[PDB]
Amino acid sequence: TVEKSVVFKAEGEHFTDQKGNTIVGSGSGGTTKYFRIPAMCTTSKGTIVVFADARHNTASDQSFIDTAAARSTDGGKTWNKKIAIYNDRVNSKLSRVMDPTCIVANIQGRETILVMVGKWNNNDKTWGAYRDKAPDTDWDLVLYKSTDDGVTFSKVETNIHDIVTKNGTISAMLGGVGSGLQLNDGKLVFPVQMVRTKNITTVLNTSFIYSTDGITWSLPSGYCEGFGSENNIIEFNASLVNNIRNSGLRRSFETKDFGKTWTEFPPMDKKVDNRNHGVQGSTITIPSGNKLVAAHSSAQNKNNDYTRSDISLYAHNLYSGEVKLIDDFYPKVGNASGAGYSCLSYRKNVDKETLYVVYEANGSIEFQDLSRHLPVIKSYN
């Protein structure tokens, strides 16, 4: 609703802890140093809720991180901000909650916002390095929910750790990053990424977790190839279709048997190139009359490195396989310390359709209203 605003400003925000004391970060004046990994969910009231890692001290992934949330009830013009999930505070250099994935769903009639983040405390290396234990003793994946339109969040006591432990071949699991979905039948679905135990040949795989009530979750029996593992799933005709990060060309598979087997999905497979290393990207579907169109955001990465420039919006014709660049919304080189991530959000409330994007911009998280592009996108089918 505003065309563009700063949600969280690098070296310009101050948060308080659970006791009311300010969190003294490494930015100027003791502010939070950097923000990364934005996830956005819009409610039926039109409220925009944005989550992101508040990396207080450094952009580094192995550092002190809390999950910040920002809410706007005026179309993205102003934001009310606070911490939604605090890390455990076991280790002041490394305790962290990170990489949010959110869902906005009607669960049994109650509109709920779910946010899932991974949690670590003493691990000093990247998650992929811990493959001995099933699962890693330092790891956890926590789920919080809001049933009051994003004002308050509370932990959900779930069976996720149990399901992972029962499987016996997973060291750690994380959400796909960005947003998950509620299927036409009502089930909640979070795309996930996992690190397998040392015995498995494939270090990483992609899959999903599903639930009808948000409390008991299940993992399907099969697995999809990992690639760069961050991914999103869309529902198209009784198939679930994912769109996965990959260095070079992005990948896309479909499951017609609810997670047991996956085959390449031609309309979206290898259609967008993010260049060296790959980047997370956001994929959602938009209805157009009786059909569907997929909208996707990711970086063009013109420098072919970690600067991940030119974060853009693409439309994918799910019928013909055609792809078109709709708009290069952040046609700038990003900060190599951490850049290029994004999250799209589409909603039609009553008769009002909005398409919004949140993305990484030099340590800050920016917002843009892309609704103007809706007719062009909607024509792609």
Side-chain angles (χ1 to χ4, degrees):
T1 322
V2 61
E3 241 184 42
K4 178 172 180 200
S5 60
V6 181
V7 181
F8 298 109
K9 185 75 197 163
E11 315 206 22
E13 306 287 343
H14 278 108
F15 294 107
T16 53
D17 66 18
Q18 289 158 116
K19 308 223 96 182
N21 303 312
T22 182
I23 300 170
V24 175
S26 292
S28 294
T31 45
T32 294
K33 183 64 170 177
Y34 211 88
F35 290 89
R36 288 270 262 153
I37 329 304
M40 179 172 259
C41 277
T42 299
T43 74
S44 67
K45 302 180 168 316
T47 304
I48 306 160
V49 179
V50 179
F51 305 94
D53 283 6
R55 308 195 171 187
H56 296 129
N57 289 326
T58 344
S60 176
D61 291 0
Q62 275 84 58
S63 71
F64 189 75
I65 306 167
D66 285 313
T67 304
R71 184 159 105 103
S72 176
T73 46
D74 64 7
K77 294 167 200 81
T78 64
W79 298 95
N80 309 247
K81 304 152 190 173
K82 59 186 229 312
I83 296 302
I85 309 165
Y86 289 95
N87 69 58
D88 295 337
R89 274 175 227 252
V90 164
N91 181 317
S92 55
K93 179 191 154 72
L94 299 169
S95 276
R96 55 197 186 270
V97 282
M98 55 202 306
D99 284 15
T101 305
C102 70
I103 293 176
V104 52
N106 289 320
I107 308 164
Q108 284 264 201
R110 286 294 285 305
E111 184 168 40
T112 306
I113 302 178
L114 301 176
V115 204
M116 189 171 72
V117 295
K119 192 170 54 69
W120 285 270
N121 274 306
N122 286 319
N123 281 178
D124 64 328
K125 269 99 66 168
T126 193
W127 75 320
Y130 298 80
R131 296 184 75 203
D132 290 17
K133 256 291 345 271
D136 178 358
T137 41
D138 196 53
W139 163 92
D140 214 347
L141 188 63
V142 291
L143 203 217
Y144 277 66
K145 71 179 187 199
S146 181
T147 239
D148 68 355
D149 206 43
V151 179
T152 66
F153 289 90
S154 66
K155 184 188 170 196
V156 176
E157 290 293 351
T158 259
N159 67 334
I160 292 165
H161 195 278
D162 291 340
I163 67 182
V164 167
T165 309
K166 289 183 221 161
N167 171 289
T169 65
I170 300 159
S171 300
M173 181 174 274
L174 230 182
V177 178
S179 58
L181 38 353
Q182 184 161 34
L183 309 180
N184 298 317
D185 75 350
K187 277 203 273 284
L188 280 19
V189 167
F190 270 114
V192 295
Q193 22 179 169
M194 63 203 72
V195 193
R196 302 298 293 284
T197 46
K198 189 67 132 32
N199 45 121
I200 318 286
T201 41
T202 51
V203 172
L204 268 33
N205 283 284
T206 50
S207 192
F208 57 90
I209 49 171
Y210 60 96
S211 175
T212 66
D213 58 13
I215 298 171
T216 300
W217 291 82
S218 314
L219 256 167
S221 52
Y223 300 92
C224 179
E225 294 318 286
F227 314 100
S229 72
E230 283 154 337
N231 67 278
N232 280 176
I233 288 162
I234 60 159
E235 182 179 37
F236 177 55
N237 293 314
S239 276
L240 287 187
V241 173
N242 60 17
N243 185 129
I244 316 162
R245 164 180 176 166
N246 189 43
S247 175
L249 310 168
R250 293 195 127 282
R251 297 312 301 275
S252 184
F253 287 83
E254 76 178 295
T255 341
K256 318 202 195 191
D257 57 22
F258 205 58
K260 278 95 253 317
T261 55
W262 292 85
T263 51
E264 295 87 338
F265 182 72
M268 215 157 40
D269 196 38
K270 303 170 178 160
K271 284 0 249 253
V272 167
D273 180 11
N274 294 318
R275 306 181 81 206
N276 268 208
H277 312 116
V279 42
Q280 173 273 344
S282 185
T283 306
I284 61 174
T285 48
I286 290 164
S288 78
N290 129 311
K291 292 165 165 215
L292 252 14
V293 175
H296 170 264
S297 53
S298 68
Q300 300 196 42
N301 188 17
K302 297 183 167 324
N303 289 168
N304 186 48
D305 63 7
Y306 274 123
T307 56
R308 288 157 173 175
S309 73
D310 290 289
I311 318 174
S312 299
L313 182 57
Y314 300 87
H316 288 111
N317 187 328
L318 303 175
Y319 304 93
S320 80
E322 290 170 278
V323 234
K324 202 76 163 82
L325 160 84
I326 301 291
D327 182 25
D328 181 354
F329 61 83
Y330 194 57
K332 293 161 79 194
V333 305
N335 193 144
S337 298
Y341 291 32
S342 63
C343 194
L344 287 161
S345 189
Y346 168 82
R347 222 173 150 106
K348 185 217 185 202
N349 287 317
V350 184
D351 74 337
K352 180 195 199 39
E353 287 174 297
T354 43
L355 176 72
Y356 296 145
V357 56
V358 273
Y359 51 89
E360 293 178 328
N362 192 25
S364 291
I365 308 298
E366 275 177 12
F367 170 90
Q368 273 183 51
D369 184 349
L370 297 180
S371 313
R372 71 182 182 107
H373 294 123
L374 286 169
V376 178
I377 300 167
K378 286 165 72 84
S379 73
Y380 232 64
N381 61 267

